[PDB]
């Protein structure tokens, strides 16, 4: 049948894949040991898109986890769900990248690529037909960016007929910890632009502000913020997983989304975010759902598109809902701000509803937006790159690995190409 | 005195969880049947179920989803022991008692006892295996269930004469 | 004998086919097992079902439809459904992949390898059928997967058999609502490909369906259940003349011959007058005058075109239930006296009536009313060209910007077909206006 | 009277013969002891068995079949099975050495010391036999040990008895699946050595058997159990004419005379229409029109030859069950009217029809259907030449490099044999195309 | 209660082994027979087998296969005393009590007690040695087996009335 196998890479992927997979497992009601507890016929039937089954009712995940430092994988294995992950999928190098993009792109990749390809093709032969692969990494990751670029380069021709879905968190515009993250991210996106199809953009300042906004609980964990983002990505996944008249396939969505190839950077959206007393202080109705989902602050990816306008929007709805409410909500938003849409296309609105409630909450939703707000983001990155390339800071490592400024010249030429691209289209 | 239906509501909620778990139940059952090799029989005795479960059950569900079926058929006997003594009973309650006593059995004739609307079990059921076999096996539970809820349905109308029949 | 065969393409069409066949088995009193009570109806498959179901000596009916669907989800839902034992196992054709709303992807990439087996189903129905008056197909122009497969299949069956009737039924693209924007493309593609082989195309719209639902049914939260039930009663009304007889019988042959003055244009619209809530019909009364006023009411239409701007060509009124010729002809005479209705001067006669004594039937658990007198008003008018006007006004800008075309060209198509589609459309309007010119 | 001797050569054929007579004992109710229950059947030994089983006053039925295998393994396991008491002790010819797939090894090194014994067996069968119309040979073309021994024994039975018939049945080489590459070599040897003596040759291929199994028998894990079940049902159907009666009985001799237009080419193809799972059987209807459309469906036949590539010459339909010649001739008239099916101009008609009233029988532990009307389809067509075409383009480059030769030249052969066989198959193909051209 | 059936299950797994080693027992029994010279007799009395054991048994297997048959015979012999007590029993249970008590006899007539489907032992029996001898001697074990099993089959059917019949 038709399934999905996942690539987990980078030290963010370390925690992110763990949280995401355990969220899925709890959503499907399996014990931490691994023996499913019979409660959901639909999920038992449809598990075959994500998990293979092992002797013992053990729906083994088809996720390939890769990094270099053994400590992270040791901690993950010691984690509550290390058992769900197999020694087969525990592949790693025995050294450190220094989070250097060039090192992780040419030096240690040169030795790990064979084995990682081996694992992924092992799973590929094991299964019949994929929609493709989705990746969890960050462009803000010194190792994730390089190794992910390597593997996408390896595979986009190997399976030229699939989905290259990617999940990546942009470093905080106010602070990037490392000073060379701009260089690493610039090179990474230079390779990503011609290869990928989908990229979900994430930022952590927005996560902190959401915590201060509705979580309001002072001291959560980065793991809990991963809980939230994993809930979002799980919601976008469940479309295939579950019934209800909505056209689920990620290609169904993408062909409906991307007006022209160069659009690969995307803004998610999510549904009820609830505080300590708002559970009993909330009237759970579709119209206020719509208001919250299209709030000015409910966005969580990059920044307020209030500067710019709207290109495409898709709204998926998880629970017991009807057609008329979402239809009239579309009408009402269209009438509320027809101006804030782009004239080249009306009805940027795309609708999809699954009739299966989430566990814990009855009716909810997810949203994905392609809007004109990433421009200021990569204008930032352009400015820092121009500044740091003006004096050529921190370059002797890259030279010693064997690169040159010529690469950066054409990469930033391409970035300016995308700059003018967006400015022409939405301006 | 009413607690029989208090237990019964949990039992029927389990039956609805089985309503979710019915195609899965037969999905495992057919793999069990292939391995047990006795395909020429209408499945009425749970001895076929035991022959199915003692072996080739290397996948989690293979044990639980079969064993709770024996668990519920034991639980119904636990309830029926309460009905056995209570009061002697009006003739209709008596008849319900004795027929349920008979129908509670290991290898009985509960093979092709298909029922009336709604009883969606055979409706949801697929094909020839379900129309030549898979008769009483899927419907015997609600049959006993309704014929035992009529037992309480006359209990509120049991007069002062019947309030003391076998309790005294 | 008197039998037509139904195709249902698209997971959008699967639930509507399921609902209508459910309704059918209800009024026929078909037990969900597939067998009748002690009363004898079975034989060599010759009774009230022999038009729709096929119940041979085994005593189990065979519905004369095939549901083709690209995705396993809802087709396996119905493969787990209640009446599946009735449903033929591999008459529920299922695929593994999508058309991704892409017309060419659904018409070329995977169609070639499914069309052969579905043709085998068609011919293995054809051998057993004799009368084969034609086909009844549940689809949509904006098939997210059904559209392209339907286009290829329609072409294939048109070329293999060009003597029977082709009856296409679709949702229309909602004029001011769009859940997706590949639909403006695929709609015109289907249209320009189908105009020269399709026989009779009929159309509905969900927005006005809901508008009715809270206008007279007054339902504030209806569902697809009601949507499918109402399209089902529409098709049941059009098939009643085959189900039974009445004062005078008619047929799809007459439907075409009268309904079509001139070729190409075969796009009328149906309407059902006694749409009303149960309590309302409980405390009101029904008769010919009011049902005629209703079927001529300009807003009970489920197409966003205005008769007062259009100009009428055809009207067929199919009455089901109890009537007499006297009062009904009085009503229609009052109509043809009435000056608001503006038919062409071309047609002296523009009316065709078909009578059945049998009243319409209801469904347990339903929400409709106790109709003893119903009528379906199937009418064609010039008012329709506005829809294509709006659609071309939408499409010209999409075509000039050629958005989304990277995918279509990547899967391997070109631009000349997208051109000739719009010149076919422009032909459609240049044929719509001069005919309305009297 | 009516009776024949069956030959069963090859460890490929031993279990299939076992299964065939396992089926055979069912319909006659032969108990695994060798005696029917208390109903009077023992005596002079003249009933339905007298053709196949031999139940004298000793009361034990005795099949008129010969099981020959060159390896002790499977013959000893069946000699430890459940019907060995039925089985005559040494008609289970057990061999102490193997032919190594080598046709010349099994034709020269080992055959001589066992041909005498098998001759003694067959003569001490022929003495007791009276009618002894012919021999039913179950073997394999790529005979690992069924090739050379079969060739030598068929040569000897041909030379000693050229007055009666010989019925050859074997698995055709798998067109695109290779279990051995010595198989083509030994196969072509056998073919060219058999063309001049083989009377009635028929071939089987497992790939499409499996395809049928998961098409309509609906099994994802079938086995030889099912394979041999199908083939044994085929041969039981073909023996039904001798077994029982109907409207008419036709014999292998007429099968030959009509089915062969012209000598050499005696390689027709059998098929069974009501191959179907019991579930479809229960919830579907069976009759002449649909079963005939199925029997002319090009992919219901185990051989990978395209009839629409070829042109039909011969067809023979056998009807097991209750039917009427009315609908029989109606269906065949529809066939003749059909334009897709292209018989050759030479034959005006193409049918040979056979009827027996008794419906087919199911087996305990059986995966087949509850079939009432059955038809066997013995057809011959031009397209089969493609199989030998494929074999020969497999052959040519092998032959060019002379691979594995050391084996055969050392064991004692030379090139002239294979040299001959090539232009032998060339003659086969050229007469194929010559008769294809009119 | 079901402890004896628990013991049987092992007994019939050893019977499954008997399927594996039954013909070898027959061959060793021949090796006994030639030197015993009681060749004009269908074997029915285990006194013949005791007359077999003591001599021409200097090769391990000769004793090893032979002895354990009497061990299982004594096993079921022990099993019968527990059945002897329980309760008086339902008529069918009592009739099975008499049947099992009757069949236990060392010098008995169990020589030609052929059984129905499947009972493959005579099927595997080769030639006329088993068509004039070797009858009930090879399946008298299933004869007690199946009927004592359908004895305990009514145990799940036993009412409160039959619960106390001979236990006190
Ligand atoms: N797992 C994890 N990642 C975090 C956390 N906080 C921030 N991150 C970011 O997630 C990014 C992506 O991780 P990787 O792709 O593995 O990064 P890398 O290639 O190893 O390079 P580094 O930035 O040095 O880690 C890191 O660069 C961090 O900046 C956290 O708490 N846990
Ligand atoms: N005919 C029909 N249409 C529906 C139904 N529900 C919603 N629709 C509308 O019909 C359209 C269905 O088109 P598609 O989504 O392309 O369906 P498809 O081609 O069969 O394949 P998918 O894309 O996988 O669904 C939707 O855009 C809706 O606007 C329904 O039950 N029946
Ligand atoms: N007729 C028949 N063929 C089979 C059967 N099972 C497998 N086959 C095919 O038949 C072929 C067997 O032929 P051989 O290997 O030459 O058998 P053989 O000539 O009797 O002697 P061996 O070399 O010992 O096997 C195999 O290649 C299989 O592909 C079966 O049950 N019956």
mmCIF file of C-alpha atoms and ligand atoms in Angstrom, chain A residues 9-16 66-67 97-100 136-146 169 171 176-178 181 184 204 208 222-223 226, ligand 1:
data_model
loop_
_atom_site.group_PDB
_atom_site.id
_atom_site.type_symbol
_atom_site.label_atom_id
_atom_site.label_comp_id
_atom_site.label_asym_id
_atom_site.label_seq_id
_atom_site.Cartn_x
_atom_site.Cartn_y
_atom_site.Cartn_z
ATOM 1 C CA UNK A 9 18.333 14.654 11.336
ATOM 2 C CA UNK A 10 20.149 17.231 13.394
ATOM 3 C CA UNK A 11 20.318 17.889 17.110
ATOM 4 C CA UNK A 12 16.872 19.490 16.979
ATOM 5 C CA UNK A 13 15.593 16.390 15.215
ATOM 6 C CA UNK A 14 16.946 14.459 18.204
ATOM 7 C CA UNK A 15 14.221 15.738 20.526
ATOM 8 C CA UNK A 16 11.692 16.624 17.825
ATOM 9 C CA UNK A 66 20.812 10.222 12.231
ATOM 10 C CA UNK A 67 23.360 12.366 14.100
ATOM 11 C CA UNK A 97 30.971 18.112 13.081
ATOM 12 C CA UNK A 98 31.647 21.206 15.156
ATOM 13 C CA UNK A 99 28.266 22.187 13.691
ATOM 14 C CA UNK A 100 30.322 23.280 10.679
ATOM 15 C CA UNK A 136 12.749 17.005 10.579
ATOM 16 C CA UNK A 137 15.781 19.272 10.814
ATOM 17 C CA UNK A 138 16.668 22.944 11.018
ATOM 18 C CA UNK A 139 18.408 25.325 8.678
ATOM 19 C CA UNK A 140 19.581 26.705 12.027
ATOM 20 C CA UNK A 141 21.447 23.445 12.593
ATOM 21 C CA UNK A 142 25.110 23.248 11.703
ATOM 22 C CA UNK A 143 24.899 19.503 11.193
ATOM 23 C CA UNK A 144 21.266 19.191 10.164
ATOM 24 C CA UNK A 145 21.633 21.652 7.296
ATOM 25 C CA UNK A 146 24.699 20.012 5.774
ATOM 26 C CA UNK A 169 13.071 26.008 12.384
ATOM 27 C CA UNK A 171 17.009 30.719 14.089
ATOM 28 C CA UNK A 176 21.235 32.858 16.813
ATOM 29 C CA UNK A 177 23.665 31.693 19.529
ATOM 30 C CA UNK A 178 26.374 30.772 17.030
ATOM 31 C CA UNK A 181 24.539 30.263 11.574
ATOM 32 C CA UNK A 184 25.345 27.786 7.373
ATOM 33 C CA UNK A 204 11.395 29.925 18.491
ATOM 34 C CA UNK A 208 8.216 31.750 23.602
ATOM 35 C CA UNK A 222 11.544 23.178 25.145
ATOM 36 C CA UNK A 223 10.123 19.657 25.033
ATOM 37 C CA UNK A 226 8.011 20.571 20.743
HETATM 38 N N1 LIG F 1 17.291 19.260 20.150
HETATM 39 C C1 LIG F 1 17.281 20.557 20.459
HETATM 40 N N2 LIG F 1 17.603 21.525 19.520
HETATM 41 C C2 LIG F 1 17.573 22.844 19.853
HETATM 42 C C3 LIG F 1 17.200 23.208 21.142
HETATM 43 N N3 LIG F 1 17.238 24.549 21.243
HETATM 44 C C4 LIG F 1 17.625 25.050 20.057
HETATM 45 N N4 LIG F 1 17.845 24.021 19.183
HETATM 46 C C5 LIG F 1 18.284 24.272 17.793
HETATM 47 O O1 LIG F 1 17.989 23.255 16.854
HETATM 48 C C6 LIG F 1 18.977 23.371 15.843
HETATM 49 C C7 LIG F 1 19.043 22.184 14.892
HETATM 50 O O2 LIG F 1 19.766 21.107 15.435
HETATM 51 P P1 LIG F 1 20.827 20.358 14.490
HETATM 52 O O3 LIG F 1 20.330 20.316 13.066
HETATM 53 O O4 LIG F 1 21.075 18.971 15.052
HETATM 54 O O5 LIG F 1 22.118 21.307 14.598
HETATM 55 P P2 LIG F 1 23.619 20.912 14.174
HETATM 56 O O6 LIG F 1 23.858 20.636 12.694
HETATM 57 O O7 LIG F 1 24.111 19.788 15.053
HETATM 58 O O8 LIG F 1 24.364 22.291 14.525
HETATM 59 P P3 LIG F 1 24.244 22.996 15.969
HETATM 60 O O9 LIG F 1 23.519 24.312 15.820
HETATM 61 O O10 LIG F 1 25.647 23.218 16.506
HETATM 62 O O11 LIG F 1 23.475 22.093 16.900
HETATM 63 C C8 LIG F 1 20.266 23.612 16.601
HETATM 64 O O12 LIG F 1 21.199 24.285 15.791
HETATM 65 C C9 LIG F 1 19.793 24.490 17.740
HETATM 66 O O13 LIG F 1 20.067 25.839 17.453
HETATM 67 C C10 LIG F 1 16.865 22.246 22.078
HETATM 68 O O14 LIG F 1 16.532 22.581 23.213
HETATM 69 N N5 LIG F 1 16.899 20.918 21.731
#
